[PDB]
């Protein structure tokens, strides 16, 4: 096998992939790794069997740096996973991890601002950010959408966001929504005195239309926009990220259509690779998990991709799914956004798991507070601040979250109607 070189030592500039592959019976693992690998040739340098699985192996592939176009996530995905999931010799194939060498990382702009620049621009420190998804999902007029945005933001929420499928429809054209949301953002800012924002959806049919929506957001002076990178495409995302860096706009990224590629354990691309591709292409926030009942998915896997998308240097940790040491050479980090049913008594768990550098999203639209949207937002803000204060005092949140919530509720009438 010219393409299986177990004695090869990967270079400091090689792009490395870790494939979890299940070959068809009768096909030796070395032959299957050689096929995936097949001066500019990709080579399989390491194959390890998965202990506790049926005929499953991890194949490590090394690609020369000259194979890829500088600063192009599109080309990287075309080269690595263009036509390899269609090999008949493989029953199942799953890309688990990528190693982006610093030499390649330096060719990317990365996220427009990052976590620290975001915190400095918004003047919010020492706590997680809070967001809500305006509900109902669709049918609402731009005026009523703006009213809901203002009501939720004035309560104490830092962000609101358009629904993932809200781009521009007969019921609510995009420019009307942008104008009414801008009025709501400014009203809530004047009322509370804190900087507010709303994830305006710029996702559109053509790059020209998407840039026009970003331009309108820039002309209104609003802080942040939103994009669907897995449906819009890396090419559209990279254009939007370059624009946002040029014009000082924050960029929230929603991972629509992700489960179509990262759900099945045997086939597809693991979300961590999609998260690294997003960080390379550019995004200040990246919807990274759902909290149905509780944070779903293995905690270690979540922590692994959160560290991969946040930290500057992540050492190899197979326990958390890190197959390679990832040096980001000072590329700005991406803030993970945990969305879903974030109930008030579940805030301590998520604050403990994520820390301060994350945005908790109430994608359920809240509305569970009997008093209204604004008091519900206040209750959430009070709960988050109380949990953060308790954690800063040395309390163990996983053991005293209920006590902290009760103690905060003892003095908060808004949280009292929420804790019931």
């Amino acid at each position: 096998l010219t393409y299986y070189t177990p004695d090869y030592q990967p270079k400091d500039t090689d792009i490395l992939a870790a494939f979890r592959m299940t070959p068809q019976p009768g096909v030796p693992p070395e032959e299957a790794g050689a096929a995936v690998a097949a001066r500019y040739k990709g080579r399989c340098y390491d194959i390890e069997p998965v202990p506790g699985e049926e005929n499953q192996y991890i194949a490590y592939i090394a690609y020369p740096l000259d194979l890829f176009e500088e600063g192009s996530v599109t080309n990287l995905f075309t080269s690595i996973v263009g036509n390899v999931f269609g090999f008949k010799a493989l029953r199942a194939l799953r890309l688990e991890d990528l190693r982006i060498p610093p030499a390649y990382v330096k060719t990317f702009q990365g996220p427009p601002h990052g976590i620290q620049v975001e915190r400095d621009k918004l003047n919010k420190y020492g706590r997680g950010l809070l967001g809500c998804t305006i509900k109902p999902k669709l049918g609402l007029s731009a005026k009523n959408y703006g009213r809901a945005v203002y009501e939720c933001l004035r309560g104490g929420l830092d962000f609101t966001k358009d629904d993932e499928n809200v781009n521009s429809q007969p019921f609510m054209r995009w420019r009307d929504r942008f104008l009414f949301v801008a009025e709501a953002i400014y009203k809530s800012q004047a009322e509370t005195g804190e900087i507010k924002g709303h994830y305006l959806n710029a996702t559109a049919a053509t790059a020209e239309e998407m840039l026009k929506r970003a331009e309108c957001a820039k002309d209104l002076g609003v802080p942040i926009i939103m994009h669907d990178y897995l449906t819009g495409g890396f090419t559209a995302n990279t254009s939007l990220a370059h624009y946002c860096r040029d014009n000082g706009l924050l960029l929230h990224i929603h991972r629509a259509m992700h489960a179509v590629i990262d759900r099945q354990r045997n086939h597809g691309i693991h979300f961590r690779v999609l998260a690294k591709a997003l960080r390379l292409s550019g995004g200040d926030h990246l919807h990274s998990g759902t909290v149905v009942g509780k944070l779903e998915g293995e905690r270690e896997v979540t922590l692994g991709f959160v560290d991969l998308m946040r930290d500057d240097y992540i050492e190899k940790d197979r326990s958390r799914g890190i197959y390679f040491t990832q040096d980001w050479v000072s590329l700005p980090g991406t803030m993970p956004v945990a969305s879903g049913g974030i109930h008030v008594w579940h805030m301590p768990a998520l604050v403990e798991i994520f820390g301060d550098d994350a945005c908790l999203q109430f994608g359920g639209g809240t509305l569970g507070h009997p008093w209204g949207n604004a008091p519900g937002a206040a209750a959430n803000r009070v709960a988050l601040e109380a949990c953060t204060q308790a954690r800063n005092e040395g309390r163990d949140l996983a053991r005293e979250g209920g006590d902290v919530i009760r103690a905060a509720c003892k003095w908060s009438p808004e949280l009292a109607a929420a804790c019931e």
Partner: peptide
Amino acid sequence: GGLSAEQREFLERKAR
């Protein structure tokens, strides 16, 4: 973890 005879056989080849 448990490795199947094939996986273990491969290990022996990788050792050789």
